[PDB]
Design an enzyme around this catalytic site. Structure first.
Site, short mmCIF file in Angstrom:
data_model
loop_
_atom_site.label_atom_id
_atom_site.label_comp_id
_atom_site.label_asym_id
_atom_site.label_seq_id
_atom_site.Cartn_x
_atom_site.Cartn_y
_atom_site.Cartn_z
N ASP A 108 0.84 -1.19 0.00
CA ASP A 108 0.00 0.00 0.00
C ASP A 108 0.88 1.24 0.00
OD1 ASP A 108 -2.20 1.72 0.15
OD2 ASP A 108 -2.22 1.65 2.35
N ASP A 150 -2.96 4.65 -2.99
CA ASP A 150 -4.12 5.11 -2.23
C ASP A 150 -4.01 6.63 -2.10
OD1 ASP A 150 -6.57 4.42 -1.01
OD2 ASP A 150 -5.68 4.62 0.98
N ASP A 154 0.73 5.48 -0.04
CA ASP A 154 -0.17 6.57 0.30
C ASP A 154 0.28 7.87 -0.36
OD1 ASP A 154 -1.94 5.15 2.33
OD2 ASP A 154 0.03 4.87 3.27
N1 LIG Z 1 -5.10 6.84 13.92
C1 LIG Z 1 -4.34 7.70 13.24
N2 LIG Z 1 -3.91 8.82 13.87
C2 LIG Z 1 -3.16 9.69 13.20
N3 LIG Z 1 -2.73 9.63 11.93
C3 LIG Z 1 -3.17 8.51 11.33
C4 LIG Z 1 -3.96 7.52 11.90
N4 LIG Z 1 -4.21 6.51 10.98
C5 LIG Z 1 -3.59 6.91 9.90
N5 LIG Z 1 -2.93 8.11 10.04
C6 LIG Z 1 -2.15 8.81 9.03
O1 LIG Z 1 -2.56 8.35 7.75
C7 LIG Z 1 -1.46 7.70 7.08
C8 LIG Z 1 -1.96 6.50 6.32
O2 LIG Z 1 -2.58 5.59 7.25
P1 LIG Z 1 -2.40 4.03 7.10
O3 LIG Z 1 -3.50 3.34 7.92
O4 LIG Z 1 -2.33 3.62 5.69
O5 LIG Z 1 -1.03 3.76 7.86
P2 LIG Z 1 0.41 3.18 7.48
O6 LIG Z 1 1.41 3.46 8.53
O7 LIG Z 1 0.75 3.68 6.08
O8 LIG Z 1 0.10 1.62 7.36
P3 LIG Z 1 0.80 0.27 6.87
O9 LIG Z 1 1.94 0.05 7.86
O10 LIG Z 1 -0.27 -0.81 7.09
O11 LIG Z 1 1.24 0.39 5.45
C9 LIG Z 1 -0.45 7.40 8.18
O12 LIG Z 1 0.88 7.35 7.66
C10 LIG Z 1 -0.64 8.58 9.13
O13 LIG Z 1 0.07 9.73 8.70
N1 LIG Z 2 -5.06 8.50 4.29
C1 LIG Z 2 -4.82 9.44 5.24
N2 LIG Z 2 -4.02 10.49 5.00
C2 LIG Z 2 -3.77 11.43 5.94
N3 LIG Z 2 -4.30 11.40 7.17
C3 LIG Z 2 -5.13 10.40 7.55
C4 LIG Z 2 -5.44 9.33 6.58
N4 LIG Z 2 -6.27 8.48 7.20
C5 LIG Z 2 -6.47 8.95 8.46
N5 LIG Z 2 -5.79 10.09 8.67
C6 LIG Z 2 -5.79 10.87 9.93
O1 LIG Z 2 -5.78 9.97 11.03
C7 LIG Z 2 -6.75 10.34 12.01
C8 LIG Z 2 -7.54 9.11 12.44
O2 LIG Z 2 -8.56 8.90 11.48
P1 LIG Z 2 -9.79 7.91 11.77
O3 LIG Z 2 -9.39 6.95 12.86
O4 LIG Z 2 -10.27 7.39 10.43
O5 LIG Z 2 -10.86 8.96 12.37
P2 LIG Z 2 -12.26 9.25 11.63
O6 LIG Z 2 -12.92 7.90 11.53
O7 LIG Z 2 -12.95 10.22 12.56
O8 LIG Z 2 -11.85 9.84 10.30
C9 LIG Z 2 -7.66 11.38 11.38
O9 LIG Z 2 -7.74 12.55 12.20
C10 LIG Z 2 -7.05 11.72 10.04
O10 LIG Z 2 -6.71 13.11 9.99
MG LIG Z 3 0.47 2.57 4.36
MG LIG Z 4 -3.47 3.04 3.27
#
Ligand SMILES: Nc1ncnc2c1ncn2[C@@H]1O[C@H](COP(=O)(O)OP(=O)(O)OP(=O)(O)O)[C@@H](O)[C@H]1O
Ligand SMILES: Nc1ncnc2c1ncn2[C@@H]1O[C@H](COP(=O)(O)OP(=O)(O)O)[C@@H](O)[C@H]1O
Ligand SMILES: [Mg+2]
Ligand SMILES: [Mg+2]
Ligand SMILES: Nc1ncnc2c1ncn2[C@@H]1O[C@H](COP(=O)(O)OP(=O)(O)OP(=O)(O)O)[C@@H](O)[C@H]1O
Ligand SMILES: Nc1ncnc2c1ncn2[C@@H]1O[C@H](COP(=O)(O)OP(=O)(O)O)[C@@H](O)[C@H]1O
Ligand SMILES: *OP(=O)(O)OC[C@H]1O[C@@H](n2cnc3c(N)ncnc32)[C@H](O)[C@@H]1O
Ligand SMILES: *OP(=O)(O)OC[C@H]1O[C@@H](n2cnc3c(N)ncnc32)[C@H](O)[C@@H]1O
Ligand SMILES: [Mg+2]
Ligand SMILES: [Mg+2]
Lengths: 568, 357, 568, 357
Positions: free
Chosen positions: B68, B120, B70
């Site tokens: 994945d 994504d 981002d």
């Molecule tokens: N619960 C959260 N709180 C704060 N920021 C979040 C949260 N979930 C996601 N984010 C932000 O969104 C981005 C994308 O989330 P994602 O769930 O794809 O995490 P990830 O670290 O890229 O996952 P993976 O290790 O599975 O590839 C993260 O890198 C982070 O900046």
């Molecule tokens: N793909 C993404 N890119 C950037 N920031 C993200 C992404 N997904 C989630 N976040 C950040 O991570 C935080 C957690 O999101 P989440 O748990 O989905 O809360 P909600 O369900 O209220 O959106 C959010 O405040 C959001 O700003």
């Molecule tokens: Mg990721």
């Molecule tokens: Mg993702």
């Protein structure tokens, strides 16, 4: 004695209701058997063709073929020249027939498809076929329906046209308005001789009465380097100068008559030309006369282009006119025998590697329509390479790219090729900017360093990358293609390694020669040509549908080619 | 402390090179195509890479699963007027044109399927107005934000608009980070799960904090995060579904202490500090409260249940026991086997074809 | 500051038991990092190479490649030039190292196959590889075992050889005895420049002291038409003039020393040349000196051919000698990269039809070895045909056969092609007798009258007949072959009709141009090239095993070729 | 008398053109190869075509069966010294060289398998000595003997060494036959069935007599022979195995009378004369005695049994009844059906591909 076949032919002519004959067969000194016979019409007669027309059936043999021709009678035969017929000219000879033989083989629209059928093989059956076609042709000529809607506008046959001299010109559709407002105006023109050819000239520029440029013709770099000599006079006419029904003027008086019918005066034009020649001291004397007219491609359509005819350059004389053949060398008139799609003919293509495969691919692409090409190479050509290459001994000691570019520019009149003598990547930034102007990048080097340098180069836009290479002993071919801003090298290398390819054995590797150490890879010319054709087809298909594509080709001993694709 | 074996394990758990070139080239091509599109020329401001790929905290998926990746597209739209659905719907023709039959919309994001990776993308907007928006856009158009290299490759990366990639013939001035008065108090707005309201996000501060923490820990934080993620993957049966992803990385970062000397010592310290800090929360059957690096009013562990935290705590305790007995062992083979108990089999125990033209 | 990789390299050099170093790294103005280091030997030392030899490791980068080279030290390094090494010359510059870098990449017999292995990619690993190879090379040079039995006899490196000028000659095995009795004799020689090439000459004839012909070299008709100028002097020597161990003489004094070692005298030769030049008033001045010697292809074998070296032409001076590269253009030395079998290369081949397929087939056959070819055609070349053809615009207006024959004669120095401008069958009996001298008859006309004339012709002996033709839209290919006194036409026609071929549709038939009536058959260049390669392979297979053979080939949209044979 | 239908039937029962070119080209190629062979250069004198193919009395085999083509190689060996087996064994290397795996020796002859036809060659010798042998060899090397055209094509063919093929542009002097004092009393020697002794043969007189008889019958003898052979093929069940081949042709030639006007009249006359001449022999249950054209001391019907002749006589009587009632019938369709009763279905009732280069 008269042979049996000729007697059967005489009986056939006698039996036919619309045919009569009284004279018998006669053998000539030139071993030709001739018979005089009259023919009738089932349609109201016209002024040009009478009802009871006398013809002469003539049979002869040249090497192993038997010629059957019907010729008009010199005394009581037709005198005008129609469509699908040679010029009807009567000469001062012992011949009792003219030279206006109808072209029965051609099938006009009036000629029924079932009626036309096919030509037999036996002499008697062929005679019957020819006679039926002659009857159809004569009634069609009487109706003036030889040329109908949907037929092509064939130019009238011109008497005494030299079969060696040719004049070339380039007129396109977009040039039609420019001449449209100049009907009735005359001026001067210049031409250049084709280097190395036999009896061929081509027009270069058009001037006016006082000698001022109005239009210049674009040519290939090979043709553009030549001496321009102003020795022609041009005049635009309303229509094609043809006499009724389809007779081409043979004497100057007939040409003046056609000019008067159009609404112009030939003697006035000649006087003006003489006066203007006197006025301009630089001008010596024109030698050719060019007549321009709008022309259609099919009867019933409207004109879209201007056609020029040439004659060797008085109006009141009865002397025969000397005609010279002319050809339109426009881009759409050069590859009417087969061409590539417009999607690839409008792309600028860069090729890295002017060796064995690259030169053949470039030649094929130039011959199929792609004209904007650049070549990147920095090596010299040697005698040995000519075992598998597209050039000859006259290019030994030159840079490969320059010689290949010259050869490409000597192919067709619409070629435009450039050469780069540096090695990838270029050092100067200007060269990098020049390279970044191309759309398709093709790699035919077989070197990994070039593949890495391609990935290390900043192209600044999305490009189509193609990589083509051969295997050991030319048993297979790798083809890879992608469409990205940067070239993927790891994926290409993985695909190359995954494919089943023969292993390299030094036993088959022969030394390049005596007094040398390094060997060479075995490959014959036919294998390289085969792979070049396959690669050209692959390039066309890739350009049609861009994407991540990889294919492997393998040749078999029986002469077949098998393909293994990869699914992504 | 068996450092080379740990390095080999890290090399074995990292994403492959083919995928790496795939995601880099895909990001660049998408940026160029988005720039050249006339209907969205003025709307699109920037397109940059984020997530675990940018922060060098990603692991190799088992099987043929696509990683994945981002990406974020920053625009200049006004969120006070436009609904999230409209903004996401403005990009459908572009995807239908350039990516036929390879794109799917899900949740708040769009997913594109490439040859080896999956992209994504999320549409975001700037909530400021005036000169503040101009400064933010200038920062978002800088080389620091528009780089496709991970944090591991660029050890000199700093969050500054006057920063340039330092390249040497074999191996100049080190520009420092920008003051917090210019970027910290300015987040971005993004759609939610249901695309009914705009929330707040701020990834640049997350990247900057990750870089600073790695610098202070002598380049061990990211590798330790990767190792803990791999351990979670191996012992999946005895572990809960959550936490995973960014919350797990946040927990790891909070647990660690500045000045890490080696991998095993860092792991032991991490687990011991995690046990020490959250013991009171564990015996009360609750969950911790951790603030996000970008937005200080948000809780990262907001969607985590208490039972998940308790199960994770128990697993961490067991892993801490194993690591503690492993570090003390002086026999190299025995210590390596003890490490292999947790990390798995990938922990070690102490062709070019011919082409012619 | 010294980077980490160079420090690791320094540690690597220090650790090695047979290597020591004290000096550190140093960056030069040309961005080159150099290090001085001494090396030891495990074999008894020789006079040419000492045991403790000082070298300089130098690293640099040109475009994207990193060059790692070890150069001998100017003060305490080796001074002689061995095999697999460049010339060790010390110049007056700030450089502390010479230019005699050993060619470590080359693998001699002494170099173990497992020891050689493969070259790594990382800089440090490459450095270790290079150093190990250097140690192996230096011990081998100390043993004088660099060149052993089974190795190729590579010519010594010549100082300051112009990379542009080339001299060509033709010496075969059968010419060895003729020169064998002339060891120690000198004479004159004449040369001719290659037309259109850059800096290439070739020898034509050999004379004696008084100017009498003793031997003439046979060339292609294109090369035979040229001006001969006698501006060379030849002398036969017992052995190759090489100094110990493998050093090429750089000054005239060293050449005189080698001559004295052989048993001859250079000043006496020069005096004789001057005296003879004075005697003959016609002779102006020789400009080149040719040295001939017997040469082997492998060490341990016996000489079978004479090799000639050229130098720009005193014996006591210390001036550098200017050397010119020479190449043997003998038939067996031209196609060492792949050639056809002897069964087809010794046959006289006649081709009827110089159109699209025939020209390409003739070019391929000429490039693969078949040199005795005749072409039969009586048509003229036009601009349109160049869309699918093997010639260019410089042949427009000529007879097809003559232009094709000239192009074939300009390919390789052993070509011998003839042209016939008549149409089959010829009328004169002399032409028939000339045609009856060929062994293989190939038909590439696509005309039935030619097929009938072939059956009607008396060949008076057994011949191999091959007929090749394409289908509509170039979707398939008919190949037929037989070996008889007369050509079977009915069987060939039956086989052609029985095969499944596309039907002719006039919709795809485009008109040849504006102002014309007859259409043309659609075919692109790549399809014709594909079928030409397949036909050449078919011809080779037929010649290998003569008999009654018929095959049909079909191309597929994916790019593959399928074959349908016929069982007799 | 329904002449066009008879002509169509004759055209339908003749050998095809592909086979024709096959046998002609094969004969010429074999002659050239035999001439160029060094071991048999002096031995071989001539190679010429004989049999039903030369005499234009052959029919098309039903199915894909290959027609039989008869060739004779005349040599200069002495039969008084050499056995037939040795002379036939002298030619084995030539066949093994030029025809690998396509030749088989059977009886007194060699058989070669071509693409569409099968060649049958017999080795013969000249029994004369001196100037007689020279004259015979000169005759055997003439164009009259070395022609591959059948008798139907060359209506001007004569047995003369001064004869040349007369070719005209559409349609000169007619040289007549040679006197019998030059060729009649000089036969050739050939092996027997068991290759144990030499017998006598003389084919040139047979060809000459066939040509003369056809000339005197206005070109109907050969066609009538073909028709009778086809009738024998059709009614095979009710007819004996013999006579067939040359003996049948000899019977037909003896039965016919000079001056044939049309086919049906000739057939009726043939059958009636056959019934009239051999009635006495038939009622005595015997067989006739007929002398060969070449050798006057031989009997053509020497291997024919009496019962075979009786069965053939009965079949001829039935066919004569049918032909007699057919000729008298004035209705064209009825007469055609009556003819179809005997001859079969082949008796009638009243594409070039495109090649580019
Ligand atoms: N619960 C959260 N709180 C704060 N920021 C979040 C949260 N979930 C996601 N984010 C932000 O969104 C981005 C994308 O989330 P994602 O769930 O794809 O995490 P990830 O670290 O890229 O996952 P993976 O290790 O599975 O590839 C993260 O890198 C982070 O900046
Ligand atoms: N793909 C993404 N890119 C950037 N920031 C993200 C992404 N997904 C989630 N976040 C950040 O991570 C935080 C957690 O999101 P989440 O748990 O989905 O809360 P909600 O369900 O209220 O959106 C959010 O405040 C959001 O700003
Ligand atoms: Mg990721
Ligand atoms: Mg993702
Ligand atoms: N019984 C015979 N008497 C005389 N000559 C014979 C006899 N049998 C054969 N011959 C001669 O030998 C030649 C070849 O004999 P063969 O049996 O093949 O006859 P054929 O007429 O060719 O047969 P077919 O009609 O079956 O092709 C004949 O043409 C004839 O000259
Ligand atoms: N292939 C042949 N070529 C020429 N003559 C032949 C051939 N076959 C048979 N004859 C002739 O036909 C006659 C009949 O032969 P046949 O019935 O076989 O008698 P035999 O069995 O005694 O040889 C023989 O006298 C022979 O000369
Ligand atoms: O089959 P072949 O060896 O003749 O093909 C090689 C061709 O490719 C050219 N080449 C190779 N590498 C380069 C680089 N780096 N830059 C430019 N041209 C290059 C060779 O010159 C040869 O034509
Ligand atoms: O495909 P294409 O039409 O160019 O090929 C035809 C070629 O064959 C030559 N040709 C055709 N017929 C003859 C005869 N009878 N004699 C000599 N040459 C012949 C055409 O000239 C063309 O080159
Ligand atoms: Mg027979
Ligand atoms: Mg037989």
């Amino acid at each position: 004695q008269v042979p049996a076949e000729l007697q059967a032919a005489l009986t056939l002519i006698n039996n036919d209701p619309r045919m009569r004959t009284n004279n018998a067969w006669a053998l000539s000194a030139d071993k030709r058997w001739s018979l005089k016979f009259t023919a009738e019409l089932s349609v109201p007669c016209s002024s040009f063709m009478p009802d009871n027309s006398v013809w002469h059936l003539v049979l002869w043999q040249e090497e192993t073929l038997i010629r059957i021709e019907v010729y008009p009678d010199k005394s009581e035969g037709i005198s005008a020249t129609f469509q699908h017929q040679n010029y009807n000219f009567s000469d001062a000879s012992t011949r009792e027939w003219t030279s206006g033989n109808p072209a029965l083989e051609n099938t006009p629209t009036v000629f029924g498809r079932n009626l036309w059928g096919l030509e037999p093989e036996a002499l008697l059956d062929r005679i019957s076929w020819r006679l039926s076609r002659l009857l159809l042709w004569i009634d069609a000529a009487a109706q003036e329906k030889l040329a109908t809607t949907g037929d092509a506008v064939e130019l009238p046959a011109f008497p005494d046209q030299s079969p060696f001299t040719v004049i070339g010109f380039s007129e396109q559709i977009d040039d039609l308005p420019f001449w449209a407002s100049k009907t009735g105006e005359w001026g001067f023109a210049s031409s250049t001789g084709l280097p190395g050819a036999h009896g061929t000239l081509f027009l270069r520029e058009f001037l006016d009465n006082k000698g001022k440029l109005i239009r210049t013709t674009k040519w290939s770099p090979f043709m553009r380097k030549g001496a321009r000599t102003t020795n022609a006079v041009w005049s635009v006419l309303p229509t094609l100068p043809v006499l009724a029904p389809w007779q081409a003027p043979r004497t100057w008086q007939e040409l003046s008559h056609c000019f008067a019918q159009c609404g112009l005066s030939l003697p006035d034009l000649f006087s003006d030309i003489g006066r203007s020649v006197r006025a301009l001291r630089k001008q010596r004397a024109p030698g050719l006369l060019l007549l321009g007219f709008p022309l259609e491609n099919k009867i019933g359509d409207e004109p879209a282009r201007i056609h020029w005819l040439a004659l060797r350059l008085q109006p009141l004389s009865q002397e025969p006119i000397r005609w010279v053949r002319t050809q339109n060398w426009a881009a759409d008139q050069l590859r009417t025998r087969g061409e590539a799609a417009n999607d690839i003919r409008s792309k600028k293509v860069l090729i890295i590697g002017a060796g064995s495969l690259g030169s053949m691919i470039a030649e094929n692409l130039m011959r199929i329509g792609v004209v904007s090409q650049g070549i990147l190479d920095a090596d010299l050509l040697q005698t040995g390479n000519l075992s598998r290459h597209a050039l000859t001994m006259t290019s030994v000691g030159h840079n490969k790219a320059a010689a290949l570019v010259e050869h490409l520019n000597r192919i067709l009149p619409d070629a435009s090729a450039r050469s780069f003598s540096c090695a990838f990547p270029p050092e100067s930034e200007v060269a990098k900017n020049s390279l970044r102007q191309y759309d398709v990048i093709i790699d035919c080097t077989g070197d990994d360093g070039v593949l890495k340098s391609l990935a290390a180069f900043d192209w600044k836009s999305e490009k189509i990358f193609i990589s083509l290479a051969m295997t050991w002993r030319a048993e297979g071919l790798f083809a890879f293609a992608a469409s990205e801003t940067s070239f993927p090298v790891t994926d290409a290398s993985s695909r190359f390694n995954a494919s089943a390819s023969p292993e390299i054995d030094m036993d088959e590797a022969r030394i390049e020669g005596i007094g040398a150490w390094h060997p060479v890879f075995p490959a014959r010319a036919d294998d390289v040509q085969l792979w070049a054709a396959v690669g050209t087809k692959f390039i066309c298909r890739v350009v049609s549908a861009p994407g991540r594509i990889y294919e492997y080709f393998k040749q078999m001993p029986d002469g077949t080619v098998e393909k293994e694709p990869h699914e992504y | 402390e068996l450092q080379p074996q740990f390095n080999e394990f890290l090399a074995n758990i990292r994403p492959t090179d083919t995928q790496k070139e795939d995601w880099k080239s895909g990001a660049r091509t998408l940026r160029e195509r988005l720039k050249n599109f006339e209907p969205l020329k003025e709307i699109v401001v920037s397109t940059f890479l984020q997530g675990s790929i940018r922060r060098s905290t990603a692991i190799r998926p088992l099987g043929d699963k696509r990683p994945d990746v981002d990406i974020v597209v920053v625009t200049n739209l006004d969120h006070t007027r436009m609904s999230p659905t409209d903004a996401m719907d403005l990009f459908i023709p572009f995807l239908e044109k350039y990516y036929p039959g390879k794109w799917e919309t899900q949740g708040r994001s769009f997913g594109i399927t490439l040859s080896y990776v999956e992209l994504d993308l999320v549409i975001t907007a700037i909530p400021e107005s005036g000169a503040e928006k101009s400064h933010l856009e200038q920062l978002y158009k800088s080389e620091s934000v528009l780089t496709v290299n991970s944090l591991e490759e660029q050890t000199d990366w700093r969050l500054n608009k006057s920063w340039t990639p330092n390249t040497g013939w074999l191996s100049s001035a080190q520009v420092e980070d920008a003051p917090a008065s210019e970027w910290k108090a300015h987040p971005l707005v993004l759609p939610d799960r249901e695309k009914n309201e705009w929330g707040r996000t701020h990834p640049l501060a997350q990247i900057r904090w990750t870089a600073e923490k790695n610098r202070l820990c002598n380049g061990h934080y990211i590798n330790l995060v990767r190792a803990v993620k791999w351990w979670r993957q191996q012992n999946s049966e005895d572990l809960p579904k959550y936490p995973k992803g960014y919350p797990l990385e946040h927990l790891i970062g909070n647990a660690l202490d500045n000045g890490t000397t080696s991998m095993a010592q860092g792991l032991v310290q991490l687990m011991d500090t995690f046990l020490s800090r959250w013991a009171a929360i564990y015996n009360q059957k609750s969950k911790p409260w951790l603030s996000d690096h970008g937005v200080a009013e948000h809780d990262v562990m907001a969607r985590l249940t208490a039972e998940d935290f308790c199960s994770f705590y128990e697993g961490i305790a067991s892993a801490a026991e194993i690591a503690r007995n492993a570090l003390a062992s002086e026999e190299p083979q025995e210590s390596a086997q003890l490490w292999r108990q947790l990390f798995g089999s990938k922990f070690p125990l102490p062709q070019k074809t011919g082409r012619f033209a």
